[PDB]
């Protein structure tokens, strides 16, 4: 079985950048080499047909060329909705395989989260477990640290993180961390707080609610 | 109009049988190579079978050799991934795609979600997130499976500031997310924020109006 190994796993570059993104094949495909753009939600789309020939209705930025084994996927100038996972696959023999991806990202401007917490619903709490959201909205970069402080301890493996995929149209991010404890377990603590850490944040941002 | 569409996915227990139909139009699938290529979430593209219905030739990944059998009926314009001994490891959104000759794949389905668990259906519990003058609001859809689900807006009325963040699993195995929107401060007793959320799944349409 023939191996496309294809780099780099990811990048980000700015909107009117030169990306390049490789395929190396561990043997001779001739130019019966593709790649294909898959953005979230959705099914590939076919961008460079036979090593180098740019399918119809796709921008003149994607460009695709071969030397010998390396197949080479070129945006010339990146645009903020090329945000996407590039993948490469070779059709000359079976299995027709596929490279491991490339997930490219749209570098900005650091944009600092607006933070909003919401207690668990009344109704919640009658159901018998108690789930506490914090909300990071419109950041950037993706990395940031948020923290649960319940009665001012520090929480751990209580919190999932869940982070939505750069707008296609702003390049931001946003955020939730969701705590989730027993009804008995809320109800024998005060103060709830999550505290942010990011790069646009000239110091930590802490919103916290006292139960009542 | 040069389509594939995908067919016969859903959720299905480990150990058994699935068929899947990709049907073709705009071109008799007798000329064209019929491919099988699936997504486990959060993965990349791992090709999967082959077929040329016009030779009856076929093609599969030593993953689900034995297990797996593509065919087609060129009278029926359709091709068929037979999924038997179901695994986790199965589970995917299984896309079908067409090559002629050659040539590399350029026309693929939409995919159809095949979830392989004996996890029991699970409809949604859906709680309020309750509220410069810009505030934020959502709601929580705890405890479904499997995915997927969907939320609009005030039915479908509101989309703009929307975020529905990816559902993460929770230990219980069961799905969990928010969906959160950013809005004037000035309309919380003026405008009513309901979120419609579809369980498709599970058959659970429920509407939850947010409010202080």
């Known amino acids: 079985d023939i191996q496309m190994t294809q780099s780099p796993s990811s990048l980000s570059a700015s909107v009117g950048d030169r990306v390049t993104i490789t395929c190396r094949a561990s043997?001779?495909?001739?130019?019966?080499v593709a790649w294909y753009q898959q953005k979230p939600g959705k099914a590939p789309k076919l961008l460079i047909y036979?090593?180098?020939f740019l399918y119809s209705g796709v921008p003149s930025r994607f460009s695709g060329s071969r030397s010998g084994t390396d197949f080479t996927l070129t945006i010339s100038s990146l645009q903020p909705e090329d945000f996407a996972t590039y993948y490469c696959?070779?059709?000359?023999?079976?299995?027709?395989?596929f490279g491991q991806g490339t997930k490219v990202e749209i570098k900005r401007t650091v944009a600092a989260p607006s933070v909003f917490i919401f207690p668990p619903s009344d109704e919640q709490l009658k159901s018998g477990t108690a789930s506490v959201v914090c909300l990071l909205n419109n950041f950037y970069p993706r990395e940031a640290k948020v923290q649960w402080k319940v009665d001012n301890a520090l929480q751990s493996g209580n919190s999932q993180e869940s982070v939505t995929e750069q707008d296609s149209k702003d390049s931001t991010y946003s955020l939730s961390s969701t705590l989730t404890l027993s009804k008995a377990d809320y109800e024998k603590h005060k103060v709830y707080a999550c505290e942010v850490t990011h790069q646009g944040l000239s110091s930590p941002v802490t919103k916290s609610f006292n139960r009542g | 109009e040069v389509q594939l569409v995908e067919s016969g996915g859903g959720l299905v227990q480990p150990g058994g049988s699935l068929r899947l139909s990709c049907a073709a139009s705009?071109?008799?699938?007798?000329?064209?190579?019929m491919h099988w290529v699936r997504q486990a979430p959060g993965k990349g593209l791992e090709w999967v079978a082959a077929?040329?219905?016009?030779?009856?030739?076929?093609y599969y990944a030593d993953s689900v050799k034995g297990r797996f059998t593509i065919s087609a009926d060129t009278s029926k314009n359709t091709a068929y991934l037979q999924m038997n001994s179901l695994r986790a490891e199965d589970t995917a959104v299984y896309y079908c795609?067409?090559?002629?000759?050659?040539?590399?794949?350029?026309?693929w389905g939409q995919g159809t979600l095949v979830t392989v668990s004996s996890a029991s259906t699970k409809g949604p519990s859906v709680f309020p997130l309750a509220p410069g003058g810009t505030a934020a609001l959502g709601c929580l859809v705890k405890d479904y499976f499997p995915e997927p689900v969907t939320v609009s807006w005030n039915s479908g009325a509101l989309t703009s500031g929307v975020h529905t963040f990816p559902a993460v699993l929770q230990s219980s195995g069961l799905y969990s997310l928010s969906s959160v929107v950013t809005v004037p401060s000035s309309s919380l007793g003026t405008q009513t924020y309901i979120c419609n959320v579809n369980h498709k799944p599970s058959n659970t349409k429920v509407d939850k109006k947010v409010e202080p």
């Open positions: 043997q001779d495909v001739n130019t019966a």
């Open positions: 696959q070779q059709v000359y023999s079976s299995p027709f395989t």
């Open positions: 077929i040329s219905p016009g030779y009856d030739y076929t």
């Open positions: 795609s067409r090559s002629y000759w050659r040539y590399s794949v350029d026309v």
């Open positions: 705009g071109f008799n699938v007798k000329y064209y190579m």
């Open positions: 036979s090593a180098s």
